């Protein structure tokens, strides 16, 4: 349309970047700098802006002067090789990743050593977040050869955009690197140099960014205990408090897949960071159009139960409004106290839970909260009507998360389920079985295989081993 | 060679083969397998040539966590499996996922690595190891049954080898103070060089304060510009390490000295030169 004139490529890349024939150190210079000035002008403008950008890197790939880019960066001449750089920036689309990733990363990793100048660094890291954004076979060159160690040495740095490249490439190689990769990024102590980014006044972005960059690294437990000996994760919390999604938030299905995770995870700071950007990226969406893919990507059954099962009340708002904003009802926090619940309790929680339809069964069985913990295989079978046997494995799941956040006051007497909970945080949904049938701290050292199978419940036989060569101790 | 597909040179030759016969190009799959929903799985099905058991899977929600674990009696009765070497096949693709997956949701102590080195193919093994709760450090207590009921190693000479190898395993020291505003940057690059250094700190997150003040060995003084015109919370903490006046040391950064504070000397700041100015102070304090 109005970018058909500009497809109509009003400039012919100036003659193709003087022909390509400047041949001068002062002209090579020049030339790169118009034809700069020529592509934001045309990445800058309303609406057309942004699909017109593409076709301008597609033009310029075409012509192979990705060629001559990477052919300038070497010349020891042109100290000025800034003007090369930052053109490579902007022109970075995926189509032109994989181009730089077949033959670019020779100079570009070559590039990172002149570490001297503001204005070189200031691109070049630019170029490292875009290619740490491909797959993982160039993140795990790039982090060998040394493209790593350049941007963690960027952090003693002060300029704005510098600092705010380096933030967001860290990130973008912990999401698309694997366990090597981030096996590395903590044995190099990145974590630990994401701190003086973490804590900064000047800007917000460039706090924001960091806290997900070690929020991700906080979602893989073979690394979690040295991430948080550092302390940069105590500073989430607030700074998520601290801030508003509302218009603070000025991604593809693709990115977002990588943002539930967080969610899914029982660390607190990732579940905030997580549905700060989640309600950031859903409200700027629904008035830039509509789109159901929230549904595929299945954010919203753990928003869901990021307000259910809650305890905080930061990653309940943001939760909250992010699942406002979506059009779907809003569930109400449930009662801690299951033992004590009535029909009316557990029909909510099954809502909760996607089991709306094995409604009718529980209410006309009469099914309460000390049914429901005790409920086994064939009742589901024989009396609810669950005849497949994974949809019983769901069940199972869900009844386990609620009985590890139980509130066990009404029915406990020696504080089991902390005891338990020390062994290991899943076994602690054992105890009702383990005192409906009458057993304490001090009975335990008499308790037998055979028992904690048919009477208490305790099936996988791992689990039981572990309890009682742990009761035998208390002696 | 396009999906579980780990070298660029490999993905492009078969996907340009692939396309000039006119066929769909598969999209490669995401490793990690456990966070996989309803839509990733469906999308597997049709790569693995199973596209017409794929309403089943969809119908009963089979998700990464149920698919890891997904026995011949649930393939049988629920999704619809009738014959025995479909259900053969299956499992030989399944496997092949399995050896390609990304357990780092999942686990902890790279159980997949020890598996690997065992046997590349017992790799497959570890989904089911650990949603029942082991490591490292309990294999040495399970038994033959257990690997078969519970985690699902079938045959029974893969059991025995992991046994008989799993049976072959047998204070705050300082504290730094600032000025919001102008002064934080400067504290943070501090405690980060020192942190490195074996060196642990206190610095301030956003009476008990106080108390910690006075464990901490050692005290830094950030000088920042202009910082002591306002003179506090600067005040306070200062004071309380004079009455204990354990080697108290500000960094000059910009400080002009325009009480009894003054009457100290401290290292001067050089944003370029450091590894220098951070190897000084080391020693100093």
Request: aromatic fraction near 6%; glycine fraction near 6%; charged fraction near 25%.
């Amino acid at each position: 349309v109005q970018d058909a004139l500009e497809r109509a490529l009003p400039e012919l890349q100036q003659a193709l970047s003087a022909l390509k024939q400047a041949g001068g150190a002062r002209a090579v210079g020049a030339g790169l700098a118009e034809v700069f000035q020529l592509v934001e002008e045309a990445w800058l403008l309303p609406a057309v802006g942004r699909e017109v950008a593409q076709g301008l890197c597609d033009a310029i790939r075409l012509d192979g002067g990705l060629d001559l880019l990477l052919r300038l960066l070497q010349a020891p001449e042109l100290e000025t090789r800034v003007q090369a750089a930052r053109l490579l920036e902007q022109i970075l689309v995926a189509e032109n990743r994989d181009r730089v990733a077949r033959i670019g990363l020779g100079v570009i990793l070559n590039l990172a050593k002149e570490r001297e100048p503001v204005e070189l660094a200031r691109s070049v890291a630019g170029i490292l977040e875009h290619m740490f954004k491909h797959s993982e076979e160039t993140c795990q060159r790039l982090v060998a050869a040394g493209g790593l160690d350049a941007v963690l040495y960027w952090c003693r740095r002060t300029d704005p955009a510098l600092l705010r490249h380096c933030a967001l490439a860290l990130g973008n190689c912990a999401l698309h690197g694997g366990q090597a990769v981030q096996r590395r990024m903590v044995e190099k102590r990145a974590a630990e140099w994401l701190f003086p980014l973490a804590f900064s006044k000047e800007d917000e972005l460039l706090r924001l960014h960091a806290c997900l960059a070690v929020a991700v690294l906080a979602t893989n437990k073979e690394v979690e205990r040295e991430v948080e000996r550092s302390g940069t994760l105590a500073l989430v919390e607030p700074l998520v408090a601290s801030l508003d999604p509302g218009r603070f938030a000025r991604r593809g299905p693709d990115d977002l897949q990588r943002l539930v995770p967080l969610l899914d995870s029982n660390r607190l700071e990732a579940q905030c960071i997580g549905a700060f950007y989640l309600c950031a990226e859903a409200a700027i969406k629904s008035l830039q159009g509509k789109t159901k893919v929230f549904s595929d990507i299945g954010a919203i059954q753990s928003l869901k139960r990021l307000v259910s099962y809650s305890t905080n009340g930061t990653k309940s708002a943001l939760a909250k409004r992010a699942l406002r904003l979506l059009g779907e009802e809003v569930p109400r926090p449930i009662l801690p106290s299951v033992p004590s619940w009535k029909e009316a309790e557990v029909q909510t929680w099954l809502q909760q839970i996607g089991f709306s339809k094995y409604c009718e069964s529980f209410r006309e069985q009469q099914v309460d909260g000390d049914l429901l913990l005790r409920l086994t295989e064939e009742e589901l079978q024989t009396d609810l009507g669950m005849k497949s046997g994974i949809t019983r494995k769901r069940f199972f799941r869900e009844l386990t998360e609620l009985k590890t956040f139980a509130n066990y006051s009404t029915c406990d007497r020696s504080n089991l389920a902390d005891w338990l909970g020390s062994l290991d945080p899943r076994f602690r949904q054992y105890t009702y079985g383990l005192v409906s049938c009458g057993l304490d701290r001090s009975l335990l050292h008499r308790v037998s295989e055979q028992q904690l199978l048919e009477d208490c419940g305790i099936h996988l036989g791992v689990h039981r081993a572990r309890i009682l060569t742990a009761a035998r101790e208390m002696l | 060679l396009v999906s579980y597909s780990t070298n660029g040179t490999k993905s492009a030759l078969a996907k340009r083969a692939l396309r000039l016969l006119g066929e769909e190009v598969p999209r490669p799959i995401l490793p990690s397998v456990p966070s996989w929903k309803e839509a990733e799985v469906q999308t597997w099905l049709q790569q693995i040539g199973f596209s017409k058991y794929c309403e089943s899977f969809r119908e009963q929600q089979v998700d990464g966590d149920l698919l890891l674990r997904l026995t011949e009696e649930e393939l049988q009765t629920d999704l619809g499996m009738k014959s025995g070497i479909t259900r053969k096949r299956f499992f030989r693709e399944l496997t092949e996922l399995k050896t390609f997956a990304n357990y780092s949701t999942c686990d902890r102590s790279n159980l997949a690595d020890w598996l690997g080195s065992l046997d590349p193919r017992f790799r497959q093994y570890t989904y089911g190891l650990v949603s029942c709760g082991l490591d490292r450090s309990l294999l040495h207590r399970v038994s033959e049954q257990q690997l078969l009921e519970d985690c699902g190693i079938h045959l029974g000479v893969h059991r025995a080898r992991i046994l008989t190898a799993a049976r072959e395993m047998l204070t705050p020291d300082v504290f730094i103070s600032y000025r919001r505003n102008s002064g934080s940057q400067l504290a943070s690059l501090l405690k980060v060089h020192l942190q490195l250094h074996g060196f642990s700190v206190f610095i301030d997150v956003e009476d008990k304060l106080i108390q910690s003040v006075m464990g901490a060995r050692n005290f830094v003084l950030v000088l920042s510009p202009g910082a002591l015109d306002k003179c506090d919370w600067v005040h306070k903490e200062i004071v309380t390490a004079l009455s204990c006046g354990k080697n108290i040391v500000p960094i000059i950064d910009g400080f002009e000295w325009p009480q009894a504070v003054l009457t100290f000397n401290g290292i001067k700041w050089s944003h370029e030169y450091q590894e220098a100015t951070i190897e000084k102070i080391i020693r100093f304090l």
